[PDB]
Amino acid sequence: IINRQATINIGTIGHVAHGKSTVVRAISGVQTVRFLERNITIKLGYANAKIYKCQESFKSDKEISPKCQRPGCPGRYKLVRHVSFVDCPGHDILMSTMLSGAAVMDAALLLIAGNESCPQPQTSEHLAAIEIMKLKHVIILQNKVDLMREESALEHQKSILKFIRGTIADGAPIVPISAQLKYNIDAVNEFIVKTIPVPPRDFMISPRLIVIRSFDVNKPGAEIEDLKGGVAGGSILNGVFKLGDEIEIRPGIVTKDKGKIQCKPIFSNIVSLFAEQNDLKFAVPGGLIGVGTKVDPTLCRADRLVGQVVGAKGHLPNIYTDIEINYFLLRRLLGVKKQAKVRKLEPNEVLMVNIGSTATGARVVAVKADMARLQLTSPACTEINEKIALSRRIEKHWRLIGWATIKK
């Protein structure tokens, strides 16, 4: 078996205590770490998957196990692609992590249960978000199908079909698969091979890195001096890294808390890399890699720096405080249990603007008809245009309004 790492990212969406983690487990082999010291930093889940060919009726394709025995052929599998999974929870309070996950993702999998409530706005909202964030590769999957009646499922499918056609996602495949009884995943695997292609990626463009998770390597058992460096789980979109480069977290931090601040952002060199199971040399983008840099084990532990941009020495981007946004509004609101109508923008009110992955608070000053000027409270960086989703407040918690683009 060759040690070729991740190439393309696939994600999973749903609801709490429904069936996403179970699905992930079914897909993979080794159990995940996520769900204070271990794993606890962000609500996002990271898991891997295998694409192995064995082609030497119509539906049979490949087996997840390293050695296939169930169909018949005892031959050795062809290496085509290795993939990394990002698990994102659809809880009503926390969605920043989900948003962050979306930015790195290039394939989306929808999972809704069968033996519960049918019309849910959250799923629709998720779909809308997917449509917005540069995606056409949408696969619909049904979770709990085994505890369902003979025609009810069919009816549900029909209803779904009726619902979904007038969207950005054109020819979306719909597959019903069980996660608790372990069946029918072959079809899914086949689909994964068929529908999803690989976009071009080269060494030319300057590196862009996003760190979601943070880890510390301190476990009880050994004596006093048995220490390892701080590991930062960072996923790459474009820009290849080799061992021997300086990694920096962009926004910066306060040095004394009186006294003026002028200290540059935190620089760190790579000590030990963690990919799939163990160590590797080259970092091919399109996967979440636990990069172990010279950042403190005391710093990376809790909710302090979740979802921030990472650059390299040599190339310099720009940091902004006043942001410029062009907005597009929707007809009626998404993600509300009954539906409510969208009001026009009002001056002097706290609203949350999500640019790419960051969750930041913004205040409205001057809006004519298309352009919007906003004031930031927590630091944020700007590169090109980014995938922007707006969130406004009416009652209790956050609600989506529409999509946005930066004009410069």
């Binding site: 119509f58 539906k59 199908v145 495949p173 597959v175 019903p176 069946y183 079809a187």
Partner: peptide, 17 residues
């Protein structure tokens, strides 16, 4: 598009305890 699904459904129906 509504073609490769029915077969899968049939297969699912077939393979049960």
């Amino acid at each position: 598009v509504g073609l490769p699904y029915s077969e899968l459904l049939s297969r699912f129906f077939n393979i049960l305890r």
